[PDB]
Amino acid sequence: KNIQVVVRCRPFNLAERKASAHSIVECDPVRKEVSVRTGGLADKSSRKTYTFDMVFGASTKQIDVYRSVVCPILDEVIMGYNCTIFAYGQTGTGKTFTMEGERSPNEEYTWEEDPLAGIIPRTLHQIFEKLTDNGTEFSVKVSLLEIYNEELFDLLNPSSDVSERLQMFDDPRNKRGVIIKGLEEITVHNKDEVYQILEKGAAKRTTAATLMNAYSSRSHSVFSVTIHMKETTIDGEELVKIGKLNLVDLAGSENNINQSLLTLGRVITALVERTPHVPYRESKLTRILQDSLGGRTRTSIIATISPASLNLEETLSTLEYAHRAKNILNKPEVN
């Protein structure tokens, strides 16, 4: 069963508009196609076109990505599957905007109604909504694990400084599993605990960016939500579901050495070509997320692109990479 791949183009910023930039990207949501102008001036051109599971043009709003991509995944998480969503693309294209979003300016909104909110805050908000009173008892735990230069950092441990690296071990009770020693899991007890947890992470990040060169563009971040669920039948028996969701904001795909990024692409290549050795163990990212790449987790990729002709080569590079990734076969199953 193919993983899901979608594409999102960012809108032009002030600078580009001021320059009367014209888009080289066309997304047709009916055909589910992205089409890129690769040459030719006005009245005759070359184009490259690619079909994906969905396509989101530059005017697409957060709410629409959330309804289309995330809603059905969260439903699956709530059924007790593990899911992963990746954001993939060059720096500046909207990976973080998609996975996190931002605040609407001038304190126009509370966080729960901000139309610029992204996947993470909307998902956490929605979990409490969907499970308010349906007879499922539940707890929600989050962790935020980052990988930079092949070291692991915990962005939510409030009593460790950002300099302290975690260690990873194989998890003996699990072929596909690792243990991250020391990784804080924070219980989010209700919707009114969410925002401040997101705040503490962001502050812990600022610090990281100060210590580590080009941190925000070279790091991979894995924001995990684990939902432990318990139903009681009419006969008093207990039904347990556990769902895990990984929300991954990857390092920029552009262009010193990102071992985890290089390995991710080599993992995809091995999977699509069906070669029997898949090099998961060659990087921390791919050991942690091994079950997401041709294993038992339902995976989606959101590949983010630019409308600007300056970014032509990296745009094509992302589309090609994303398009190949569609042939990855996963076998989701209940926990």
Ligand X SMILES: CC1(C)CC(=O)C2=C(C1)NC(=S)N[C@H]2c1cccc(O)c1
Pick the closest to residue 65 from 26, 94, 90, 89 (CA basis).
94
Binding residue positions: 89-96
Question: And the tokens for 131?
Answer: 């499970």
215 vs 207: CA distance, rounded Å:
10
- 241 near ligand ADP, rule: CB under 6 A: no
How many alpha carbons fall within 13 Å on the CB side of residue 328? 32
Question: Quick one: 80 or 92, whose CB is closer to ligand ADP?
Answer: 92
For residue 312, the tally of other CB atoms under 10 A from its CB is: 17
- 94 near ligand ADP, rule: CB under 6 A: yes
DSSP class of 68 = I
Question: Quick one: 52 or 215, whose CB is closer to ligand X?
Answer: 215
The least distance separating ligand ADP from the CB of residue 62, rounded to whole angstroms, comes to: 8
Measured in whole angstroms, the distance separating CA 324 from the mean position of its chain's CA atoms is 18
Judged by phi (left if over 0) then psi (alpha if -120 to 50, else beta), residue 150 lies in left
Outline where 80-175 has alpha helix (H).
95-99, 119-130
Name the one range near ligand ADP by CB under 6 A: 14-22, 85-93, 268-276, 317-325: 85-93
- 279 near ligand ADP, rule: CB under 6 A: no
Residue 150 binding target from Mg ion, ligand ADP, ligand X, none, CB below 5 to 8 Å by type? none
- 304 near ligand ADP, rule: CB under 6 A: yes
Question: Quick one: 304 or 330, whose CB is closer to ligand ADP?
Answer: 304
Return the CA Rg of the chain: 20
- Interacting residues toward ligand X by CB under 6 A: 100-103, 111, 114, 116-118, 120-121, 198-199, 202
Q: Which amino acid is at 312?
A: L
- 104 near ligand ADP, rule: CB under 6 A: no
- 93 near ligand ADP, rule: CB under 6 A: yes
220 vs 210: CA distance, rounded Å:
17
Among 10, 122, 220, 284, binds ligand ADP (CB under 6 A): 10
Question: Quick one: 65 or 162, whose CB is closer to ligand ADP?
Answer: 65
Residue 202 binding target from ligand X, ligand ADP, Mg ion, none, CB below 5 to 8 Å by type? ligand X
Question: Quick one: 168 or 222, whose CB is closer to Mg ion?
Answer: 222
* Residue spans of beta strands (DSSP E) within 113-214: 136-148, 151-154, 167-170, 178-181, 186-188
Pick the closest to residue 322 from 105, 64, 53 (CA basis).
53
- Interacting residues toward Mg ion by CB under 5 A: 95-96, 219, 249
Residue 154 binding target from ligand ADP, ligand X, Mg ion, none, CB below 5 to 8 Å by type? none
- 123 near ligand ADP, rule: CB under 6 A: no
Q: 327 by DSSP, 3-state: which?
A: coil
Instruction: Kindly list the residues in this chain that would bind ligand ADP in the complex (CB under 6 A).
Output: 10-11, 89, 91-97, 102, 304
